[PDB]
Amino acid sequence: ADTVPAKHLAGARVWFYDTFEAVDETVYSQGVTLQARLLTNTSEGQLAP
Amino acid sequence: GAKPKAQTVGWRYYFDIHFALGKKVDEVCAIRASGKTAWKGSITSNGQ
Amino acid sequence: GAKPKAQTVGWRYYFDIHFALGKKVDEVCAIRASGKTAWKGSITSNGQ
Amino acid sequence: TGVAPPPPGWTPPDRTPRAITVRRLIEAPYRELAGVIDPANLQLLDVSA
Amino acid sequence: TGVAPPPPGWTPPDRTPRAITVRRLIEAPYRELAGVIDPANLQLLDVSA
Amino acid sequence: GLTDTYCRTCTAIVGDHRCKVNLVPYRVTLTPQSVSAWVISSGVVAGYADGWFTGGYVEWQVDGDNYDRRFIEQHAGADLHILGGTEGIPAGGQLRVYPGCDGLAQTCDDKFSNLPNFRGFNAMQGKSPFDGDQVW
């Protein structure tokens, strides 16, 4: 894709994001800083922010 | 926009249950659930 | 076209039910439904 | 008495949602946009999107 | 006899759908079209739409 | 003829054909120190932890090859509480006393190390059905 090989020390995390990612449909311009949080969901309810 | 990259239509539930059929038994023939023959056969010794 | 402005995935049902637990009672401790503790506490006088 | 009652009762499941410990944020490269966005809308997308 | 049987039985709910009494028709302004229609299709929309 | 329950305790008499535990090593032969209306006291048993003999029985020879047996309500220090009173117990006759099993898996294994033959079901399932209402 748009990447080049680089050294990865032991313990690096590998993500198979293909078909397993949450996407925000809103379009944002470059240079903007965002703050986001992930809330877990279970049959008992949702995590308190 | 367009169709989502993937859709979560349903979930698959996995459970590990331990149960007893009573006192000593010799052979288990088949398992039937909801009127459908899930498994048919015969086992006479401890195994998978 | 595009995604609908809003989607009706489900509905919330509201019901007002009046029921009696029998003869005079002193205290109600908790309510359990479907194996989950919905409410736990103690009330000794008529109130909300 | 001599006999004692052991603890195990219903053993309720412990759902009590926890906060996510492992996570990450990324920027979507052109691959997923090409594969998920129709050409008509994609072509009008500016370079800064 | 002296005692009489009172009416209340099952008290079935009265659904029997009625015709809507309060309603209105409107024309969608450009705001909702902009917020619900992708730019590629929106730009091709004629002024008379 | 049911003789079957899915509970947490052993559900077996210590030494029965199901427990397969040999009580002969645990046999204790002693001469009681003092006998009362309801309590038989001996100093030898004082050296065991409280409740060691709880659930056991006392067997002694009456005549020939026949023994009459009694029970132990509770064992505390040097005093033994006999079920039904100590009437008929000789004051100087030789008595054989066996221990008792509480039935808990911890008790079964730590004391007798008979866990493989443990007939109880401690934590396999207490309520869990596969046709309930809400698994969560």
Q: What is the compact description of this entry?
A:
It is classed as virus. With 49 residues, chain A is low in regular secondary structure. Chain A is built from no helices and two strands.
3D architecture notes:
The structure is cut from a larger assembly and holds five copies of chain A and one copy of chain F (136 residues). Chain A is low in regular secondary structure and 49 residues long. Chain A has strands at residues 41-42, 45-46. Chain A is extended, with a radius of gyration of 16 Å. Chain A starts with 40 loop residues before the first strand and ends with a strand. Chain A contains no helices and two strands. Chain F is mainly beta and 136 residues long. Chain F contains one helix and seven strands. Chain F has one helix at residues 105-112; strands at 28-30, 34-35, 39-41, 57-63, 66-76, 79-82, 95-97. The longest helix of chain F has 8 residues, at 105-112. Chain F is elongated. The N and C termini of chain F lie far apart (38 Å). The A-D interface holds A 1-2, 13, 15, 17, 21, 23, 27, 29-30, 36, 38, 40-47 and D 15-20, 22-26, 28-31, 48-49.
- Helix-strand topology string of chain A: EE
Largest sheet of chain A: 2 strands, antiparallel
Quickly give the structural class of chain A: little secondary structure
Helix content of chain A: under 10%
Which quaternary structure do these chains form?
A: part of a larger assembly
Number of strands of chain A: 2
- Placed side by side, the strands forming the largest sheet of chain F appear as 1-7-4-5-6-3-2
Q: Into which percentage range does the β-strand content of chain F fall?
A: 15-25%
Number of continuous helical runs of chain F? 1
The percent range for helix content of chain F is under 10%
The interface involving the most residues is between:
A-D, 20 and 17 residues
- From the N-terminal CA to the C-terminal CA of chain F, the straight-line distance is 38 Å
Outline of chain F, from the CA principal axes?
elongated
* H and E string of chain F: EEEEEEEH
Organism (chain F): Pseudomonas phage JBD30
Protein name (chain F): Bacteriophage phiJL001 Gp84 C-terminal domain-containing protein
